[PDB]
């Protein structure tokens, strides 16, 4: 079992988009107050996630990214160029070199 | 139109700014907390009722968050138990043992600390089906009910049992020193050696070092859990194992505890006929081996049953063979002509589970687990198991060899992990069979499917050339009416004696004189010699020594016949019942899957109305899938006396 990685089992709301939470605040599901303590209805925000390849399918460890494509007033840079269009030489053609 | 709601601050701003308030614009008071309609030329109040507070988490909010905290706890901490587990039961050393310990102490008192915590939530304000079944699930204090001093003595006792049982080991007047066990010592002496003055002392001898030392035990046992099972609300303690099958809080479904005892005893009473038939076709055999030792009118004794109890009756297969000359459904030379090994019969169930419909198998499976024997430096347990380790684990524990059977056990097994992975999705309470009687049977359903000449001829275990007689049928009913009908009287007799003996129906010096009595007059059952009330012969058997409901084998067997006439309907197979084959059919697997899935977070009821149709369990596939053997049993039966004679006894 791999027990380096947590998981945000409990949180005080939703997410906003794009947040990453790292506060580690005792949640508390009852009104007694856990107090930096975890006592009755007091849990842990993060669960401690176990890694076991014996796990299954639905259940494996999966490194997953995602990505946001956001394009705002700078101009777009991350793409891949057509370039391509091998260069072909005398012949009348309509050129287009970087611009 | 449309109107929104109006909300200011104080009553003399809403007279100021109600003016300009259309009609069908709902005021409402912040500081008078009131609400009102704006109607033509006023604004009518509208009539609020008392003050509810706002609520953080409701009482059943509560038990939902901490019943979700607890599975999410209970999952790595199972886990961690079951891999401990696995381990001890792959290699058996020493710091396999402790782990047990730690492990076991772990859980149990993990389960403890969250059945207390749950204990508070009340069950009758919280509407959710689920959470109350998980909770009711949860809060079964079993043992902690009693004292501390009641609770420990209740279980070294059980612990006892199970010691002697055990360790129960007789010795031959002839060589004191020479002693055996019950297994697999007096087992197969009983089951292959012809010798009646052999199995009859071994009977006598196991049941009284056995019988009579677990006597003042078993019955302080018997009066622990009927006063635990009073402590719990219970009337007696087969009530409390009856709990599971216990329905309540869904309409049209509930079922009571009191409704499965009946059920038994009305599948037990069609069965009669049947099994009255079997009984007489054994009993006039056993004069053709053996005639003069047994009687027809008379009973048959327990030890000449093919065991002591007479829990199943295949080994008498060969004493009661109704055509010895032609040749049993066995595929062996298939086996070594082609070397078939345990992964290939497995990875064949796993293509035949494809086939039906069902998807495939994880492969964590294949590299954590083993099939055949794991050499010979460590020693792994060779009963087989399957296993649900939780969090998607699941594994198999047997050293499977290639023998029909094995194929037929690794089907099983596939069948229990199937049910594994199907509930995997409910909550950790609710990741388990409804009952103790549906895992068994879809293990059990697989291998009578896979046991079917279909299937082999489908796979190329059966030769293509291979003819199907009215004998071979016939020999096939007759040894699984053995096995299976066979021990349905067994699990009756014993499930049911078990019952009144803990109601306390059964007086102290009359135990043996009802028991063995009734074994007469019931089931036909007779014990070779007289046993006394100092003897504890029905206490005697693995699972009512070892704190286990024995009710689990004859609701199995219920439930495995009504799935494999159900699957069998939904594949729109042509022929016998017995020759029925589940093969190529998604039908059968879509179905069987709609009530694997749910588990135990649907009521059982409702997991057997999603196949056979109704929540009762009748045993009209057990006569529709013998028909032809009862048929055959009348016509064996015609002239050969039916039933048997209470009177009589071998002693007598």
Redesign the interface.
């Known amino acids: 079992?791999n027990y380096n990685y947590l998981y945000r089992?409990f949180r005080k709301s939703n997410l906003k988009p794009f947040e990453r939470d790292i506060s580690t605040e005792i949640y508390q599901?009852?009104?007694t107050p856990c107090n930096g303590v975890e006592g009755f209805?007091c849990?842990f925000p993060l669960?401690?996630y176990?890694f076991?390849?014996?796990?299954?399918?639905?259940?494996?460890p999966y490194r997953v990214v995602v990505l946001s494509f956001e394009l705002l007033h700078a101009p777009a840079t991350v793409c891949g160029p057509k370039k391509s269009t091998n260069l072909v030489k005398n012949k009348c053609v309509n050129f287009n070199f970087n611009g | 139109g449309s109107s929104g709601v109006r909300l200011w601050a104080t009553r003399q701003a809403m007279l100021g700014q109600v003016h300009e308030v259309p009609e069908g614009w709902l005021i409402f008071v912040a500081e008078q907390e009131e609400l009102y309609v704006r109607v033509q030329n006023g604004f009518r109040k509208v009539q609020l009722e008392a003050r509810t507070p706002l609520p953080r988490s409701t009482i059943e909010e509560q038990a939902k968050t901490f019943l979700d905290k607890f599975n999410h706890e209970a999952e790595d901490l199972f886990y961690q138990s079951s891999l401990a587990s696995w381990n001890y039961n792959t290699n058996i050393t020493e710091e396999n043992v402790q782990n047990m310990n730690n492990a076991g102490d772990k859980w149990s008192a993990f389960l403890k600390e969250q059945s207390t915590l749950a204990q508070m939530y009340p069950l009758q304000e919280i509407q959710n089906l689920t959470v109350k079944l998980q909770l009711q699930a949860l809060q079964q204090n079993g043992s902690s009910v009693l004292s501390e001093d009641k609770s420990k003595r209740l279980n070294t006792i059980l612990n006892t049992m199970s010691t002697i049982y055990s360790t129960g080991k007789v010795c031959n007047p002839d060589n004191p020193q020479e002693c055996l066990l019950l297994e697999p010592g007096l087992n197969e002496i009983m089951a292959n050696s012809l010798d009646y003055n052999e199995r009859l002392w071994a009977w006598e001898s196991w049941r009284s070092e056995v019988g009579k030392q677990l006597r003042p035990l078993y019955e302080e046992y018997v009066v622990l859990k009927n006063e635990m099972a009073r402590a719990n609300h219970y009337e007696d303690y087969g009530d409390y194992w009856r709990g599971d099958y216990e329905v309540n809080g869904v309409d049209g479904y509930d079922y009571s505890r009191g409704q499965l005892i009946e059920d038994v005893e009305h599948t037990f009473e069609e069965i009669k006929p049947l099994y009255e038939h079997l009984h007489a076709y054994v009993r006039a055999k056993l004069m053709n081996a053996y005639p003069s030792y047994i009687s027809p009118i008379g009973c048959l004794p327990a030890h000449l049953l093919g065991d002591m109890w007479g829990r199943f009756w295949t080994n008498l297969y060969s004493l009661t063979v109704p055509f010895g000359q032609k040749p049993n459904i066995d595929v062996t030379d298939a086996m070594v002509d082609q070397a078939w090994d345990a992964q290939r019969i497995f990875k064949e169930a796993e293509k035949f589970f494809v086939s039906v419909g069902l998807p495939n198998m994880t492969q964590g499976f294949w590299e954590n687990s083993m099939l055949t024997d794991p050499g010979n430096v460590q020693k792994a347990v060779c009963h087989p198991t399957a296993w649900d380790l939780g969090k998607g684990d699941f594994r198999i524990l047997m050293c499977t060899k290639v023998t029909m059977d094995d194929f037929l056990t690794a089907h099983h097994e596939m069948g229990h992990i199937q049910y594994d992975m199907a509930y995997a999705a409910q909550p950790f309470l609710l990741r388990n069979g409804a009952n103790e009687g549906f895992h068994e049977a879809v293990g059990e359903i697989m291998s009578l499917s896979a046991a079917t000449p279909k299937h082999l001829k489908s796979i190329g275990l059966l030769s293509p050339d291979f003819q199907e007689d009215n004998e071979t049928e016939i020999n096939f009913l007759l040894k699984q009416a053995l096995t299976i009908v066979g021990t349905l009287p067994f699990t009756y007799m014993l499930e049911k004696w078990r019952w009144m003996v803990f109601k306390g129906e059964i007086p102290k010096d009359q135990w043996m004189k009802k028991w063995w009595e009734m074994k007469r007059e019931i089931v036909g059952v007779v014990e070779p010699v007289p046993h006394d009330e100092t003897y504890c012969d029905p206490a005697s058997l693995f699972h009512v020594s070892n704190d286990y409901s024995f009710i689990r084998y004859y609701t199995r067997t219920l439930y495995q016949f009504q799935f494999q006439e159900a699957l069998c309907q939904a594949a729109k197979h042509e022929g016998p019942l017995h020759k029925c084959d589940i093969s190529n059919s998604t039908e059968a697997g879509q179905k069987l899957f709609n009530m694997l899935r749910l588990g135990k977070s649907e009521p059982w009821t409702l997991a057997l109305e999603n196949v056979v149709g109704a929540k009762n369990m009748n045993v009209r596939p057990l006569l529709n899938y013998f028909e032809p053997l009862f048929t055959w049993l009348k016509d064996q039966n015609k002239n050969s006396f039916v039933g048997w004679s209470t009177d009589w006894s071998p002693y007598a």
């Open positions: 079992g089992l599901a009852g009104s209805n849990y669960q401690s176990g076991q390849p014996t796990n299954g399918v639905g259940y494996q």
